[PDB]
A paper describes a structure:
The structure reveals the expected conserved [name] dimer. The [name] N-terminal domain is resolved for both [name] monomers, allowing the first 30 (Molecule 1) and 20 (Molecule 2) residues, respectively, to be modeled into the electron density. The structure reveals that the dissociation of [name]’s C-loop exposes a unique binding surface, allowing [name] to form a hydrophobic scaffold around [name]’s C-terminal domain. The first twenty residues form a β-hairpin, which pairs with the core β-sheet of [name]’s C-terminal domain in a parallel orientation. The interface with [name] is mediated by hydrophobic side chains of β-hairpin residues I12, I13, F14, and V15 which complement the exposed hydrophobic edge of [name]’s C-terminal domain.
The [name] disulfide relay is mediated within the [name] intermembrane space (IMS) by the [name]/[name] chaperone, itself a member of the CHCH family. Among more complex eukaryotes, however, the [name] N-terminus lacks this mitochondria-targeting membrane tether and instead forms an NAD(H)-regulated complex with IMM-anchored oxidoreductase Apoptosis-Inducing Factor ([name]). NADH is known to allosterically stimulate [name] dimerization and release a 50-residue disordered loop from [name]’s surface by reducing and forming a stable charge-transfer complex (CTC) with [name]’s FAD cofactor. Here we find that [name]’s scaffolding of dimeric [name] unveils a dedicated, NAD(H)-regulated import platform within the IMS that anchors and orients [name] to encounter incoming substrates, while also unshielding the [name] active site to stimulate disulfide chaperone activity.
Residue numbers in the entry: 127 to 511, 558 to 613, 999 to 1030
């Protein structure tokens, strides 16, 4: 039972909303914050759904939804125990405030002038400050939408706890699973499913239009190296694949590609991008970004007076890097926190950069920051003992580093932040790479230029010489 009025209203019960709620409470100890969540589940982190929860030793991981971190500490996907929240009944009156989550309730109408929303059940809530943190909904393929009810019921869109539970069940009861999508989600699920299938010898297929996995973010040579790694996890990878039609044939899904090839499979998992949830822009009169999608907000994540946007749904202005829309866990954290600080009057711009990460089997793990885009010219520095095992990849624009990928090297994000912040025009990025110490614990080094991409292979002796890189202090 929601209150008629609440000081802080958070639309969406995901990662960005929770971070904003924690941030608001940290700056305003008496704050009373209401999260309106369409989802019946309380706020939870999503990255475990495509990684750690598939690799748990526990047979009941599907019910406990607990996973063990790299440090060995078991954790819950939920951000907080249910007890840490207060009920919506008590939110207006409980001493020193708190955070309540109204679950199973969708905001369907937004009035920015009168600072009011309406829920799917007719309730109306007025607010003083409002955060839109609606995230996005998985996109679908046109060929899937034309295939009818049978195919659509055998096609999974992966995002929620429920999606993990249903796919985990299917993985134990079918013989072939086909993943459509080459990005981080399609690739992470392929490695997880591929690893589950090694025991029973079942089939796992991944197909996508690009030349290789992660083709939109990684340079072509590293995308190819990565594809071979995914293939080595027991996955049949089909690059250069454009789905022309899908149908059911003799109890089995049959995918037809423009190439002419054909795939027969028992279940499809479609990981082909995200659609920002901008339905409230119509009633609210809020602007949507035509180039990036999502609500257009400024550097402070503000859309209009008393209304902010954070997370996957927010197209914001980065003072250093330009207008962006970022769909990553740590961004939802950073943006939700920034929005909460600004809802309490901080008026701070996006400055501390968000990062992201992925793991594609045991041989591929990276962190990244900034404009990681494979269309940009790049300089990649890899350790020489072609093996792309450990290294750092710089993404350039106007001779300036605007994005960095840390390839199988960890705890280097501090250095990567400084490089992005300073914005220097470096004459030799091999000198900058020395700061990352990619050989921690005798032939000559060499380099190669493959179109827009430079590839430097550096030995320990050369890499651990003094660096002339310019750092701003
Ligand atoms: C399986 C998976 C694995 C991932 N792995 C990684 C990873 O390894 N690294 C990484 O950096 N990122 C990863 N991500 C991305 C990261 O999880 C997302 O960027 C993050 O969840 C975005 O949080 P959010 O708050 O912006 O949106 P969401 O988490 O989508 O939260 C939005 C919530 O609001 C609800 N909602 C929508 N509209 C309304 C409305 N009108 N009223 C009320 N509620 C509404 C939605 O139902 C949803 O519950 C992964 C995502 C998924 C799905």
């Amino acid at each position: 039972k929601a209150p008629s009025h609440v000081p802080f209203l958070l639309i969406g019960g995901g990662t960005a909303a929770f971070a904003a709620a924690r941030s608001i409470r940290a700056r305003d100890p008496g704050a009373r914050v209401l999260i309106v969540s369409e989802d019946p589940e309380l706020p939870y982190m999503r990255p475990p759904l495509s990684k750690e929860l598939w690799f748990s030793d526990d047979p009941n991981v599907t019910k406990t939804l607990r996973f063990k971190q790299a440090n060995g500490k078991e954790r819950s996907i939920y951000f907080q125990p249910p007890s840490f929240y207060v009920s919506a009944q008590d939110l207006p009156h409980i001493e020193n405030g708190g955070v309540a989550v109204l679950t199973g309730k969708k905001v369907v109408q937004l009035d920015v002038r009168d600072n009011m929303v309406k829920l799917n059940d007719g309730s109306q809530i007025t607010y003083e400050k409002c955060l839109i943190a609606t995230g996005g909904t998985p996109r679908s393929l046109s060929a899937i939408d034309r295939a009818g009810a049978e195919v659509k019921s055998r096609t999974t869109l992966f995002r929620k706890i429920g999606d993990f539970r249903s796919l985990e069940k299917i993985s134990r009861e079918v013989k072939s699973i086909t993943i459509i999508g080459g990005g981080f989600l399609g690739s992470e699920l392929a490695c997880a499913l591929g690893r589950k299938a090694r025991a029973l010898g079942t089939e796992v297929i991944q197909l996508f239009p690009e030349k290789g996995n992660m083709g939109k973010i990684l340079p072509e040579y590293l995308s190819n190296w990565t594809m071979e790694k995914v293939r080595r996890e027991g996955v049949k990878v089909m690059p250069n694949a454009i789905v022309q039609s899908v149908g059911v044939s003799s109890g089995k899904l049959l995918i037809k590609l423009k190439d002419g090839r054909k795939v027969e499979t028992d279940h499809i998992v479609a990981a082909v991008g995200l659609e920002p949830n901008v339905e409230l822009a119509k009633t609210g009169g809020l602007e949507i970004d035509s180039d990036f999608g999502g609500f257009r907000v400024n550097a402070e994540l503000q859309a209009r007076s008393n209304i902010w946007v954070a997370g996957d749904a927010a197209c914001f202005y980065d003072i250093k890097l330009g207008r962006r829309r970022v769909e990553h866990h740590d961004h939802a954290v950073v943006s939700g926190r920034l929005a909460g600080e600004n809802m309490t009057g901080a008026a701070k711009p996006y400055w501390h950069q968000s990062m992201f990460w992925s793991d594609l089997g045991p041989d591929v793990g990276y962190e990244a920051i900034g404009l990681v885009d494979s269309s940009l010219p790049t300089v990649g520095v890899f350790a020489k003992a072609e093996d792309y095992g450990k290294g750092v990849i710089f993404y350039l624009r106007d001779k300036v580093v605007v994005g960095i990928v840390l390839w199988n090297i960890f705890n280097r994000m501090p250095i990567a932040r400084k490089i992005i912040k300073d914005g220097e025009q470096h004459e030799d990025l091999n000198e900058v790479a020395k700061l990352f110490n990619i050989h921690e614990d005798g032939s000559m080094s060499y380099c190669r230029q493959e179109g827009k991409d430079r590839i430097i292979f550096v030995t320990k002796e050369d890499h651990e010489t003094p660096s002339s890189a310019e750092l701003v202090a």
